[PDB]
Design a protein around this ligand. Structure first.
Ligand SMILES: C=C1/C(=C\C=C2/CCC[C@@]3(C)[C@H]2CC[C@@H]3[C@]2(C)C[C@@H](CC(C)(C)O)CO2)C[C@@H](O)[C@H](C)[C@@H]1O
Length: 255
C-alpha cells in the first residue's frame, strides 16, 4: 500500500552534495594519522584506573585524532544544504553539541566486526577498547559505544543513508542554547524527508524494514553516549597536566 514518491531533483542534489562533502572530509586511508602525537600503550592488562590516569598513555594520540575529526566535521557541516542559512551563533551551538556524536557515527566506517576494533592501518593505528581505557575512560562509556558500533553496522546503511544521518544529527533543533529552533527544524526536516524518501524508493527489502525508525533510535543512542562521554571527560579533566594532552579545540568543545 505504501506509496514510493520518487526523490525530487532537489533531494537528489542534497544527496550528491552530502556524498561530496563526506568524500572531501573523510580520508578512508587515514593517511594523516602519522602527523598526530604517537600512540603509546602502557602495560595495563589489569585495567588499573590509577595507572591509566597516572600515564594517560593513549590520550595525546586519541585527542589529536578526535581534534582532527572535529575539524573535518566542521567542514562537513558547512556543506550541509541550509546550514549556512543559520546564524554563526546557532552554527557553533550545533557543532559543539554534536561533535562527539558525529565522531562516533563517522567512526563506524573504520570500525570492523572482524575483531571489534577501529582499524585505521597497521598495528599502531588499530584502536581497541583497551586504548580507550588507556585514555582515561571507563566501561560505562565503552560498553554502550561498542554496542552502538555493532548495531549501526548491522543496519548495513547505504553511504547515502550514512551521510544523511550525520547531517540530521548535526542539524538538531533540540540542542540547548539554540536560538532559531524553527529554522533548524526546517533544515532538518528537508534532510529527514530526503532520507525517508530515499529508504522507501532505493533501499531493497528486508534491510529497509522499519529502517528509518532504527536510524532515529541510533540518534537517541548517540545522545546517551554524549552525556556519558561528557561526565567522564569532566573527571578526566581533574587529572593534573591533562590539558597538555588534549588540544585547544578539544578543550573548548568538551570543557
Ligand atoms: C575518530 C574517528 C576514528 C575512530 C574513532 C574511535 C577510535 C578511538 C577511540 C574513539 C576516538 C573512537 C570513537 C570514540 C572513541 C573515544 C571514546 C573518544 C575519545 C574521548 C576523549 C579522550 C577525547 O575524551 C577517547 O575514545 C577513525 C576514523 O573513522 C575517523 C577519523 C573518525 O573520525
Amino acid at each position: 500500500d505504501s506509496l514510493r514518491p520518487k526523490l525530487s531533483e532537489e533531494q537528489q542534489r542534497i544527496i550528491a552534495i552530502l556524498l561530496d562533502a563526506h568524500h572531501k572530509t573523510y580520508d578512508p586511508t587515514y593517511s594523516d594519522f602519522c602527523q598526530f602525537r604517537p600512540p603509546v600503550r602502557v602495560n595495563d592488562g589489569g585495567g588499573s584506573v590509577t595507572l591509566e590516569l597516572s600515564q594517560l598513555s593513549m590520550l595525546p594520540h586519541l585527542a589529536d585524532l578526535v581534534s582532527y575529526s572535529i575539524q573535518k566535521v566542521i567542514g562537513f557541516a558547512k556543506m550541509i544544504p541550509g546550514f549556512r542559512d543559520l546564524t554563526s551563533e546557532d552554527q557553533i551551538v550545533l557543532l559543539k553539541s554534536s561533535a562527539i556524536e558525529v565522531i562516533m557515527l563517522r567512526s563506524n566506517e573504520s570500525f570492523t566486526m572482524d575483531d571489534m576494533s577501529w582499524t585505521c592501518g597497521n598495528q599502531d593505528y588499530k584502536y581497541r577498547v583497551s586504548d580507550v581505557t588507556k585514555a582515561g575512560h571507563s566501561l560505562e562509556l565503552i560498553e554502550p559505544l561498542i554496542k552502538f558500533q555493532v548495531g549501526l553496522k548491522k543496519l548495513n546503511l547505504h553511504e547515502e543513508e550514512h551521510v544523511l544521518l550525520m547531517a540530521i544529527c548535526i542539524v538538531s533543533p533540540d540542542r540547548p542554547g539554540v536560538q532559531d529552533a524553527a529554522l533548524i527544524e526546517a533544515i532538518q526536516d528537508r534532510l529527514s524527508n530526503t532520507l525517508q524518501t530515499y529508504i522507501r524508493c532505493r533501499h531493497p527489502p528486508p534491510g529497509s524494514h522499519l529502517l528509518y525508525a532504527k536510524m532515529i533510535q541510533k540518534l537517541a543512542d548517540l545522545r546517551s553516549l554524549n552525556e556519558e562521554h561528557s561526565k567522564q571527560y569532566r573527571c578526566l579533566s581533574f587529572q593534573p597536566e591533562c590539558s597538555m594532552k588534549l588540544t585547544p579545540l578539544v578543550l573548548e568543545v568538551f570543557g
